[PDB]
């Protein structure tokens, strides 16, 4: 549908003019929606849309040839972690919407086309999430997730938000 475009002027430039030039931007806009660096977003994916690609935006830039790029730090759904779904004491204390609403942060970063961004979402701490659920706007939790810890895809290890290997 409609394309994301840059908001305003670049924040920074790298390289000489020409094929090596890179113009960095803090925000993209589409109609009345704005997404900025530090926000989390849902990305368009190929299939299985119960596991949307969700990432934190680290930086965005345009390179030569009208290429709009976003650098993304991916979150992982608990099903996606190598311990799988069956792995999810710790089981007792976890919310009953854990499989649907919890996300692990990771250090897995990728560069992607800005036009694969679908829409903004929120990934907050557990206590923040529970307080937001008491309200009316965030009643229904649309696009709202909470952080369950860290996943290391290279080792398969999961860590709590306190850094405790799980």
């Amino acid at each position: 549908r409609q394309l994301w475009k840059w908001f305003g002027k670049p924040t920074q430039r790298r390289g000489m003019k020409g094929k090596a030039r890179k113009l960095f931007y803090k925000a993209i806009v589409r109609g009345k929606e704005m997404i900025r660096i530090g926000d989390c977003a849902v990305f368009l994916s190929a299939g299985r849309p119960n596991l949307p690609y969700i990432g934190r935006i680290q930086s965005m830039w345009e390179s030569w040839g009208n290429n709009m790029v976003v650098r993304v730090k991916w979150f992982y759904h608990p099903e996606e972690t190598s311990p799988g779904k069956q792995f999810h004491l710790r089981v007792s204390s976890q919310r009953k919407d854990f499989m649907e609403r919890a996300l692990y942060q990771s250090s897995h970063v990728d560069e992607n086309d800005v036009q694969t961004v679908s829409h903004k979402c929120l990934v907050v701490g557990l206590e923040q999430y529970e307080q937001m659920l008491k309200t009316k706007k965030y009643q229904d939790s649309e696009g709202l997730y909470y952080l369950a810890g860290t996943y290391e895809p290279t080792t398969g290890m999961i860590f709590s938000t306190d850094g405790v290997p799980v």
Binding site: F43, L44, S45, A46, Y53, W74, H108, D110, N112, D113, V114, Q115, T116, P153
Partner: peptide, 8 residues
């Protein structure tokens, strides 16, 4: 662009 890509 059509769909995003993930490495591993």
């Amino acid at each position: 662009k059509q769909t995003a890509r993930k490495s591993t």
